[PDB]
Amino acid sequence: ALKPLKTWSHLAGNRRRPSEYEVVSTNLHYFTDNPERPWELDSNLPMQTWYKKYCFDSPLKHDDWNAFRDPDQLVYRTYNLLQDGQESYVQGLFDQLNDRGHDQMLTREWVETLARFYTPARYLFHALQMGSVYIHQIAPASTITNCATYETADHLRWLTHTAYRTRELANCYPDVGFGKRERDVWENDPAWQGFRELIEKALIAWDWGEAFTAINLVTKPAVEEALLQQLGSLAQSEGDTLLGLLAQAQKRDAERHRRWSSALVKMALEKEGNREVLQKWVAKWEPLADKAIEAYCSALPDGENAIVEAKSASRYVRQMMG
Amino acid sequence: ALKPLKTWSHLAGNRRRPSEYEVVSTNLHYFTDNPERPWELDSNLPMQTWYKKYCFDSPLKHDDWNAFRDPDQLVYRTYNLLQDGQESYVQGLFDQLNDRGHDQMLTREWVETLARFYTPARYLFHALQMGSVYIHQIAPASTITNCATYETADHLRWLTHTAYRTRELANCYPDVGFGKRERDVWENDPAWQGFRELIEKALIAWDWGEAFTAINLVTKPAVEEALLQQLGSLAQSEGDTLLGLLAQAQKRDAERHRRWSSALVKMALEKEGNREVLQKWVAKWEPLADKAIEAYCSALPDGENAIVEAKSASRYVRQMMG
Amino acid sequence: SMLKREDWYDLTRTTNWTPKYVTENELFPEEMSGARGISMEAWEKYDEPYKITYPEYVSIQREKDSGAYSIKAALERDGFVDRADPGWVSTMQLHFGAIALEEYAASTAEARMARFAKAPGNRNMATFGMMDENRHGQIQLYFPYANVKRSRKWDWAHKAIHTNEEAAIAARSFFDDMMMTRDSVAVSIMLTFAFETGFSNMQFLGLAADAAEAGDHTFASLISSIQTDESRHAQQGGPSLKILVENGKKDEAQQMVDVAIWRSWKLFSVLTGPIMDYYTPLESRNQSFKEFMLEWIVAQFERQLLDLGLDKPWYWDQFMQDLDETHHGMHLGVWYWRPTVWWDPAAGVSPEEREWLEEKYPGWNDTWGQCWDVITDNLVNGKPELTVPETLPTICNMCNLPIAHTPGNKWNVKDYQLEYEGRLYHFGSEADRWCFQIDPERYKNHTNLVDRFLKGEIQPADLAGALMYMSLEPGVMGDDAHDYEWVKAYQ
Amino acid sequence: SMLKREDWYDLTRTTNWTPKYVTENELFPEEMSGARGISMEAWEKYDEPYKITYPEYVSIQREKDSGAYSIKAALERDGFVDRADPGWVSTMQLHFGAIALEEYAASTAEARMARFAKAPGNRNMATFGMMDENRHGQIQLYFPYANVKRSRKWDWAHKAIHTNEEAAIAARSFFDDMMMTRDSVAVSIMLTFAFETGFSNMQFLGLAADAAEAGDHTFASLISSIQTDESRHAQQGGPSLKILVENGKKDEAQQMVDVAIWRSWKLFSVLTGPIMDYYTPLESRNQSFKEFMLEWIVAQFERQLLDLGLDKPWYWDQFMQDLDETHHGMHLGVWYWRPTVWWDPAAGVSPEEREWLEEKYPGWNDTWGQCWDVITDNLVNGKPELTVPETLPTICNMCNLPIAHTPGNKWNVKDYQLEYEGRLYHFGSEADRWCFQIDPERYKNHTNLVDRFLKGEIQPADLAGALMYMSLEPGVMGDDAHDYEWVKAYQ
Amino acid sequence: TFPIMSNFERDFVIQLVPVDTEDTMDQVAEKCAYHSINRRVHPQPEKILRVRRHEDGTLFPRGMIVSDAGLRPTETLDIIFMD
Amino acid sequence: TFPIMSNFERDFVIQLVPVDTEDTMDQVAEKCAYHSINRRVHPQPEKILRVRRHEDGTLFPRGMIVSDAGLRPTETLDIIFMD
Ligand SMILES: [Fe+3]
Ligand SMILES: [Fe+3]
Ligand SMILES: [Fe+3]
Ligand SMILES: [Fe+3]
Ligand SMILES: [O-]
Ligand SMILES: [O-]
């Protein structure tokens, strides 16, 4: 008879009694048990090939990815406690800034800016959702996957805000075509084409390390600094106090996606050769980021300064992880 | 043997199965069982005398006060669900408007206005707390008492906001004496003396009907329209967006205190002679309200208009109940 | 970023101002505040040890209720109540009846301090206290209400205190005295310090263990949740007490405390005592009601008091003795008078129970053992009418409970009579008499059940008429909890 | 004021755009999307019946977890697990092992649709679905973990699927096939429509009633909560199906559905079947696993299908018959092979159980009754080594379950052999064979436990070596759940 | 008629016993024992039931009546065992 | 040595039985019954155990051996009752 344990068997001898985070998140993927046959089926199925090539054969190598730990340490239960709070705050804003007819107080000019620069962001935000959900399903450890799981809800969270606010703007201003125009602005507007190319191309990087980098290290800070930092500063200086607040709220989400991205990078550097691997992918993608931040911000009031602030703020995120 | 019942015995035959509100709130006071001896002790104790005189012998008469029903239908459990939401929203504001250093962006003038007109309101707000808790303990039915119970928490809720915001302002602006000056402003400032006299005098109206009227029908709308409506409109037009929002949030609380006050008045009018009784108490107190709204608002920017808007808005609350 | 609590807390309780348009005494009438000649400024030293603020309160208490109610709903369809040992069911039905509306009335008690205390810290604490007792009353109605179709007795969670049934009077006698009819300062001491800190905090714990042991998790969770609210407002007596002693009123302080404990003791001896030693199953009992008292109640009092700079009450010694004797009295009363209470008292004198009773209280069978012998022969022998009553016991005019002590061999049943303005009062103990005597005007006018019978207030003046006067009726009238199951063991 | 949901919902799912800088097929590779030549625009007709949005989701699901976890914590100290009929304990230990990490892997399955579906409604629904299965996996680890110091078997809530123990393979065989290795559209159909709607929704209900009946409220609450999440994402197959038929792919639609049900049926016949008819106590059984199937599973399928414009699968008739026979097979396998599973199988052939078995399935003792007779004599007569095994059963290469049918009197145990590229496969039923045959390349390469033994992959090649290859060890090795208590009844 | 309170030997509880101004200490005891003997105290026919004022200890001749006892209404009396 | 699958009469489950290229249909049956008779099927010493190819129904002379049977490895065979 083997003795009853103190904790799970994979967590034995750990000094300190494992946390809820550790109990419910660690070492859960099983396809990583047989890299010659990840799935209980013929080893030549397209899906076997897909995981061998885009997960196992990533240039981003580590001996024990299961080692990884979300610094915010998020589990489904603590995720909804956090976000239900943060939604009370934002739905609170919508509810009450409405009561007060905040939407009527905005200028003809700012409305035109909202339709070009603010609403169409439902497409960009959804594409991130898509991006982060691809990371979920190819990452090589359940703790990596989980961080991507919550970020994906965050992404849909942002798409939802924008969706909702777009009706409200269509209700207050029916002749603007809010909720009808966004697709053609997304597809045909020079200001968007920088971002759209980046994110289309990003979404076909199947390698898990490359998807992580393209999406979390290069694309997201650029979307974040451009659509949330820059447009948000503008909103407020321009009387759109709802959006100045909306944006700051979503940036809390982004800051957390940064915190875990940062830890994962911190983790890859324990192993020689990985820094170069990351750097080389950054240097592939960074150009397209610049293209995005230029096409978008330059069309804003005080264009060049926004371009210079965003460029260096998105750069700063990455410098901080080495 | 008497048969097992469908609901409580005092709620039998009611057509529809009684709600949670009805189950946990109705017919709970017992001192109303013996108006010759409310308390299980000598009938001549000061407290027996106090309830005979200030509860039983009120000029505001009804055959069955237990009849009364809070239209919002609040119970302890639904109260905290409501308010925990509403606190998430307000603490959300504090948290995030801070992050952004909203306090630094306010003008030297507006800060001086905050100290004269905004902070000292911890005394006024606490006095309301005291006022509403006196109603609790003398009202002649548990459903009446309960409405006063929650309003009292609301009152302390507002005192708490102001308390917290006062530190923040003392932190940002240490030489203003925020948190030190308020008592002397409360006691010695012409702008406050209108309110202070009203509320001191109000707090010694022991009769339950008179306390209800003095406090919920005359004092509260005046405090509400002056400190929350008027100062709030000012906050916002003056760049204090936190307070413009803070105030609107608290006015939701006030609106509910109005809803139940209104129902109670609606209830007293089922009985001849009560309207006059109410009207006569209003006409006793209304003058002191006017005095309050004049001393306060006239010291504001655009003084007279505030005076005229508040006077008629607080009047409007009462006209709507007849 | 948010501030840390410590940084702003004091401004929540910096709320005193010098009135002008009215006078201090007008705004704080002495009959409601009880400031006792001590100054506004000197009450501002009042500093509560356990601190909370509005947003924390509504946030935590939301959780507590989500728990409790979710559990209630979870277990409901399993109808555990339908199978529980009826010693338990009875324990519960007695609790709801005696406590639910007093919990409610407690919010007013708190409401009193909240308006009339000169100590600002006290005022706000009391507002939460107020909210706490609102919860307790509400939740302790919602829970029994699950069971109204099971038996009319559950309706009493609501009716009890609207009746003149003996227990309701005993109850209202105690609460009205401690918490409804005293000034703000008085209340903090006699209710939060003496009763809540003194007794119900530890009782509620004990009750929750018992509920669990018995397999009623719904109830275990209930009591357990409520218990978590106690100290938040129970704290309020301590600071009041300090201020009174620090300020040369150690005697008045002392006296209310003496009164507060005795009255609380007596109510406790009929409501918890009999449960511990007779309604709980024999195997489910961790300790005697006397072991429980000493360990979990009495040391804590001496601890508390010495620390405050007070002395043990004059009667402390007697109290120590009375632990062997009172509640067995109380229990014998209730059981023998069973059709006059609203639950089914458990006899608890099966043989095994009887030796347990002897172990815990040596000298028992040779005292309390006797009366029970006679009762037993009576049901053995087929004459069970001699185990219901045909008169009324003498009710103590203080605790409104039967005057009773040890009988049989060491029989020592005493009555502390007192004549006072051409009327004769009866007192179930020295302490009860002394309570009346130091404050006669507070009680003089009042009449207990026996007085009312003796005066023609109960009509028809037979036992069936007293039953209608007490709103009791077949179906709620109390009988033996086990249906005389424990009888078979003598035959 | 807020908007009403209906007013803005559509904009949450107006998310398709025409790519330019890459091509549709690059962004939506056919192997992951399975758009099947149907156009972007035509997938935009995809309209989910049950709608939710982010703020509602996080708000509701916060409540669900407060409930569940509060209840778990409430009951924990009462340690109900320590006393439960071990038919129950076993039921649970098998559930956690087989399901917990597959629930987890389901989030990836959802993740797949969420990225690769051309139907925007589907994409967002799948994101919530993803969050749902994250919960399920997490919670179904947190709960068993309460019990790790009680027995090593509970560690299997975690280990199971990281092993090559027969059940783990059967499990991974089914899930990897339905949900991990198929395109987005395929998944919606084979997992959410066929399996989740088809089976686990009603099973989870049934399991929760059983848990309650058994007195495990912690578990009853668990399963019950999870069950409330099912339809929200289970819905996803319906709209997919409509679009495929409306658009001239009724046959492909048809086929995945056929495959999906059979494989789901077979897994269900070993995981739920034996529990219903053998591990649950005799009094606690509401109906037979066959009564349960017909009523709660099979009509619903015909209902669903007719409404979609599909036909009953070719094998439907056989299926109807096999309800009398398969699971008794499955159960006999597990029990006889008990030291190779991680819980203690309950025999369930005590006399009373035996006539119940006869009532529900007339013809039983004269078939399944036999083998059990011999087993029984063997323990009656003191030779119990003849009731463990000395070889391996033939494993079906499709369901990775033992090939077995009725024996005794009407013995009819068949094997659907097939030779395919100079290798001989074995199939436990016609339907299993046909699954391989219509899609040979999906399976060809794979080897079930027997193949691996037969190839030298298991070393030492005795039974003790197979035990180490399957990570099993004394203490987790399965024995008779009642410790042969039901044996005494024959002597 | 007259109210008194009965403190019966070897019983636990004092009770209310109506008696009559004309009853003897003996007949008092008869009325008392009705509510205590064979309900809760064992009879002692080797003995005789005496009647003493509870307040101060004073013993009453078996034969005097209420009216002669100078009793306060509602007064508590011991009912003891002697011979 | 040779792997085969044993479909034993009145048993529920086909099993894996190693045999040897040199065994007789008779000795096959001996090896099979070891895993089915007195474990799960009742013996019939009024009877004789025959051996038929499961696939197509073909009956095998009691005395021929594996090597002569033209068997596919892993092949399933019936083990029935006759006389
Ligand atoms: Fe309480
Ligand atoms: Fe309390
Ligand atoms: Fe699930
Ligand atoms: Fe699911
Ligand atoms: O309380
Ligand atoms: O699932």
Side-chain angles (χ1 to χ4, degrees), chain A residues 54-321:
Chain A
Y54 292 135
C55 176
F56 291 116
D57 298 339
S58 183
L60 191 66
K61 305 194 206 187
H62 191 293
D63 270 316
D64 188 17
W65 284 120
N66 279 299
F68 185 80
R69 301 289 180 256
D70 167 4
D72 297 85
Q73 269 188 261
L74 274 173
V75 308
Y76 181 89
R77 183 190 68 84
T78 53
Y79 180 80
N80 294 134
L81 269 167
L82 202 215
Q83 295 298 56
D84 182 66
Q86 291 278 315
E87 284 296 87
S88 286
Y89 171 75
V90 164
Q91 314 295 303
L93 270 210
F94 294 167
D95 188 11
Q96 292 210 14
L97 281 175
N98 164 107
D99 277 341
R100 154 144 123 189
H102 161 286
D103 286 358
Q104 291 105 112
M105 302 323 284
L106 311 154
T107 88
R108 201 42 206 206
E109 291 84 16
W110 183 251
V111 179
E112 268 132 49
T113 322
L114 284 184
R116 196 179 177 206
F117 289 99
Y118 170 63
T119 49
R122 77 161 177 275
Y123 292 99
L124 195 49
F125 288 158
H126 185 64
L128 294 169
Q129 193 183 341
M130 285 170 66
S132 52
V133 87
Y134 179 79
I135 295 158
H136 163 123
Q137 80 200 63
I138 190 79
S142 58
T143 54
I144 298 171
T145 285
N146 280 187
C147 283
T149 306
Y150 309 136
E151 166 180 338
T152 301
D154 297 327
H155 288 342
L156 174 69
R157 164 161 187 245
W158 305 352
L159 151 70
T160 310
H161 294 335
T162 305
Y164 183 93
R165 280 296 282 158
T166 301
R167 250 286 83 67
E168 286 218 314
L169 294 157
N171 279 348
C172 197
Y173 293 103
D175 65 337
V176 190
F178 278 121
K180 273 153 179 156
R181 265 58 151 173
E182 288 78 24
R183 184 174 187 175
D184 296 319
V185 171
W186 173 239
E187 298 170 10
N188 312 259
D189 187 307
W192 286 104
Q193 291 318 303
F195 271 111
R196 183 181 161 213
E197 183 184 345
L198 168 69
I199 199 51
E200 280 175 20
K201 283 177 175 174
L203 295 175
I204 63 169
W206 308 121
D207 185 281
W208 88 266
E210 202 187 359
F212 172 65
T213 307
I215 304 295
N216 274 32
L217 299 179
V218 184
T219 305
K220 277 182 59 86
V223 186
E224 277 150 17
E225 299 293 331
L227 272 63
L228 306 183
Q229 196 53 49
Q230 296 306 315
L231 195 63
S233 272
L234 201 34
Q236 191 201 328
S237 82
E238 279 283 312
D240 190 326
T241 140
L242 188 160
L243 185 44
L245 288 173
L246 188 54
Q248 173 161 349
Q250 303 151 343
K251 192 140 210 241
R252 282 171 96 73
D253 287 344
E255 259 136 29
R256 173 172 61 250
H257 309 142
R258 278 168 215 185
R259 293 192 281 279
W260 83 259
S261 297
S262 171
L264 184 52
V265 158
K266 178 179 180 204
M267 175 168 168
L269 304 196
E270 310 177 328
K271 164 148 222 295
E272 274 171 352
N274 267 349
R275 196 203 319 274
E276 301 58 72
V277 154
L278 289 175
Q279 280 168 344
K280 186 194 312 325
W281 274 330
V282 179
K284 168 181 196 218
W285 293 100
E286 206 174 34
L288 275 166
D290 298 346
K291 209 153 141 303
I293 291 152
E294 288 160 16
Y296 187 83
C297 296
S298 80
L300 298 190
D302 199 335
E304 313 334 271
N305 192 73
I307 289 177
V308 170
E309 281 188 295
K311 267 187 185 199
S312 104
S314 42
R315 258 142 221 186
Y316 196 57
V317 168
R318 273 185 315 277
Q319 307 165 23
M320 286 310 90
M321 339 142 168

Side-chain angles (χ1 to χ4, degrees), chain C residues 99 102-103 106 132-133 136 175 179 191 195-196 200 204 226 230 233:
Chain C
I99 291 300
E102 298 285 25
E103 295 269 28
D132 297 333
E133 307 289 16
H136 297 164
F175 297 97
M179 81 189 191
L191 166 79
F195 180 71
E196 266 161 324
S200 56
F204 264 54
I226 292 160
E230 209 62 43
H233 64 258

